[PDB]
Every structure is written in C-alpha cells, then in structure tokens.
C-alpha cells in the first residue's frame, strides 16, 4: 500500500518551526532536522521534531545527523511518542541538497517521510507541506528520488486543539486567558451572533426567491440540532429541577466563600 497519504502533525511542530526560524542563531534562510513520527502505514501520526544549525548553500550540504540521532534519544527518552521518519527542511522545495541529506538519512536507513517549511507571504500555497518519495530504488547517482506531496491532518488531543483555538484568537489579537468563565460566555454570545446573522439571511433569501438552497436541511437540520440540546422543548417541570439547581449552586457557592472566611478565621489566629 502507499505509505504516504496523510501526515498527522499538530501545532507543537508549528511552534518548533517558527521559534527555530525566529532565533536561528545565524540560520541565514534554511533550517533542517530529522522528522519524528509514528506509522499506522496508511495515516502517518506525527508529534515532535528537532532542529540543527546548517550552512545550506550550493554545493555545501549540511544536516548534523549523528546529533539528530542523539537528540532522537532525548526526544524519545522525554516522551515515548515516535521514531525518526525523514528530513524536515525550510524553503526551497526538492533540489540536490534535499536528496544529498536523504543520503545522510539513508546513513541510518529508515523509510523517508519529510516536511517542508514555507518561507513566503503567499495565501494560495499552504503554510506547511509534508512530502514522501517512491523510487527510492537508487543504486545509481546520489539519490534520484521521485517526490510525492502529502496533505497534512491537524489531529491530536482536543483540549490542546481548543487551546490552539484560543491561540488562533491570540493570533487575531491576544487575548490573555484571565477571565475564563466571563470571556467564554462572551464567545458563547459571539456564537449566538453567528446564528442570528446566518439564520435571518438564509430565511429572507427564500422570502425573495430561491434561498435556503445550501440551508434547506443542512442548517435546517442544524437549527433542529441547536434545539436538540439547547433549549429543551418548553418543560416547566425541568425549570423547577433547575430552580432547585439555582438553590444548590448558591449552596456550593456559599460553602465556597465561607471556607474563604475559614482560611483567616481558623488558620490565622496564629496571627496575634
């Protein structure tokens, strides 16, 4: 089966890209390393990487592999995640140096799985692009390797990825995480603005002529999905259940600020 279909890395390696490229320690343009990733042999589940100082020019090829082997020992010793998969490089894409460091990678001899870093302000070109190669026969020149592109999936632990989702809101304009409750109710309201502005126009489009096309039983099913679990139909018996909930939180909350008093009250008659 094709080993290279989709490489499943997450924003740890995105943070490994920028930081390594925003200090560099005189890393002119091109930073490279050995990609660390697991293999289900269909979807390539990736986590971490680690980087090297290079003089990547023509025709000087440099990836400190032995060092990348020794910090492979570090990365695995810290977390039992993966083993080395390939070389991960900055711009530009496939040339003679990328295959001369694949020689440096066949020095240790696993199955290659790569990841390019895009040093550009394009929007059409995706920020990050993973690469494999077949043929991969090569008892010939240096390495005449036939590169396949790999689409990326951003799939690991989801409270990271919702942590990412607020890093996306930092990315917009931070956005410190201080007022958790108060501010996750602001974005809960922001969600409800998206509903009303969306639901009104997809109504009034079919009031005019032929709206609710991509909104017939797509959002129509997801209007139903809104009301599936908020609110509940109109059951005043469940409102009483809640109104007794309003009693028990008051209690949880009262117990709460009393044990606040029970700090200094008991714990500090030490303080006389």
């Amino acid at each position: 089966f094709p080993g290279g279909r989709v490489v499943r890395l997450h924003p740890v390696i995105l943070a490994s890209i920028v930081d390594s490229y925003e200090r560099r320690n005189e890393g002119a343009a091109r930073v490279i390393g050995t990609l660390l990733g697991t293999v289900d042999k269909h979807s390539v589940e990736v986590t971490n990487c680690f980087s090297v100082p290079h003089n990547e020019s023509e025709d000087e090829v440099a990836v400190d592999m032995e060092f990348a082997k020794n910090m492979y020992e570090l990365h695995k010793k810290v977390s039992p995640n993966e083993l080395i998969l390939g070389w991960y490089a900055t711009g530009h894409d496939i040339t003679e140096h990328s295959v001369l460091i694949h020689e440096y990678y066949s020095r240790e001899a696993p199955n290659p799985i790569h990841l390019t870093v895009d040093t550009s302000l394009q929007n059409g070109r995706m920020s990050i692009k993973a690469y494999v190669s077949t043929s991969m026969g090569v008892p010939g020149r240096t390495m005449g390797v036939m590169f396949t592109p790999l689409t990326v999936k951003y799939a690991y632990y989801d409270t990271e990825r919702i942590g990412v989702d607020l890093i996306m809101k930092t990315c917009f304009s931070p956005n410190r995480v201080i007022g958790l409750s108060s501010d996750l109710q602001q974005v809960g309201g922001a969600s409800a603005r998206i509903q009303d502005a969306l639901s009104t126009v997809l109504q009034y489009a079919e009031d005019v002529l032929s709206g609710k096309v991509s909104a017939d039983n797509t959002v129509g099913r997801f209007l139903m999905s809104l009301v599936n679990q908020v609110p509940k139909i109109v059951p005043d018996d469940f409102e009483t259940m809640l109104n007794s909930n309003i009693n028990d939180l008051l209690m949880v909350t009262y117990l709460a600020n009393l044990t606040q008093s029970q700090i200094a009250l008991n714990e500090k008659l030490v303080n006389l």
Binding site: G188, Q195, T218, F222, Q229, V230, F238, M241
Partner: protein
C-alpha cells in the same frame, strides 16, 4: 469504608502475574480478538450467537435468542461439562444488560408482562435481580412498585449511575438527556461545520 484504593491497585499485582501491563477492561478485548479469526474459529454451535449478545439487539427477541443456545451448549457430557458454570452469570449479565436495553429503548412497560417478556428460569429472584440492577444502578427504575408500573424517568440522573460506572454496556440504542455546557456544545457544533 476503609481505604478503597487497596485491591483495585492490587489488580495490577494480579495483572503483572498474568503477563498484563494494565488491569483488564471489557468486550473491546474480544473485538480486538475478532480482529483474529475467533468468531469464525468458534464452532457454528455458538459462532452465530455472540452476533446477538453484542451486535444484533432486540428487547423482545434476545431472551428467546441467548437462552435457546444456552441450552444448545448445556449439552453436558461430550461438550466439556466445565463450560456449564457460565449459565448463571450469562443469566446475571442478560438481566442487567437487556434491562439497560429495555430501560433506554422505552421509558415505561409494566413488569405485569416484563416477567414473561423475559421468559428465563427465574420469577421472584428475577424481580429481586431487577431490584439488584436498580440498587447498584446499571439503570434507574423506581424499584418496588406493587401495581408493578415501573417507569424509568428523564433525566434527573446522568450523575454517577448512567454507564455503571463509566464503560458503555449499551449497543447504539440509547436515548438523549440534557445537562450543563450541553448548550455551547451541539449549538456551537452544528454551527461551525455548515461554515
């Protein structure tokens, strides 16, 4: 009462003796072992039945599916008379499992007919094993109804006793309930996929 975490931690000390790394979980074991050829390697005496125990569910037609082949293996002499100790736990499991099924499937059937609807080998210990399913809370039904009109209730209790304790012993029937943040949830789910 005294130090709950002892024997549950000792379950590792048993598991390490067995050659296990973590303590045992449930049917997930048999399903990463029907990954192997077992549900075909097993004899067509009981190849076909496990497909009803787990996957093919019915609150009406599984008390008359499990128990026929219970008797089909009850064959004592030449069908290894050691596999006969599993009939009163298959009973115990069938009660508390198929009761979860019925309890999530519908929300009210009188045991005036549930008694015969489960035509097993029990009657009064059947009632008291339905009470045993209620007390230790595989499900919730209002236990000791004299008229025997036992409704299950909605919702009031997805606290400690929904999954009993966390593992799901329901095949993909179970009906819906509401709780706290559940708003954000589906509302904000069904939101961001259509855009």
């Amino acid at each position: 009462l005294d130090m709950d975490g002892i024997i549950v931690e000792k379950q590792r000390r048993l598991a390490t003796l067995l050659g296990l790394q973590a303590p045992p979980t449930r049917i997930g074991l048999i399903n990463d072992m029907v990954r192997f050829n077992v549900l075909q390697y097993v004899v067509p005496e009981v190849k076909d039945l496990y497909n009803w125990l787990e996957v093919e569910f019915n609150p009406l037609k599984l008390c008359e599916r499990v128990t026929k082949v219970l008797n089909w293996v009850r064959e004592q002499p030449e069908k290894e008379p050691e596999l006969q100790q599993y009939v009163p736990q298959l009973q115990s499991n069938t009660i508390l499992r198929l009761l979860q099924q019925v309890a999530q499937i519908y929300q009210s059937i009188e045991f005036s007919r549930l008694t015969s609807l489960v035509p097993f080998v029990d009657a009064f210990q059947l009632e008291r094993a339905i009470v045993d399913a209620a007390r230790h809370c595989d499900l919730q039904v209002r236990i000791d109804h004299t008229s025997r009109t036992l409704s299950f209730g909605s919702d009031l209790n997805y606290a400690t006793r929904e999954d009993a304790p966390i593992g799901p012993h329901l095949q993909s029937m179970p009906s819906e309930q509401i709780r706290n943040q559940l708003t954000a949830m589906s509302s904000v789910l069904a939101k961001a996929l259509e855009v």
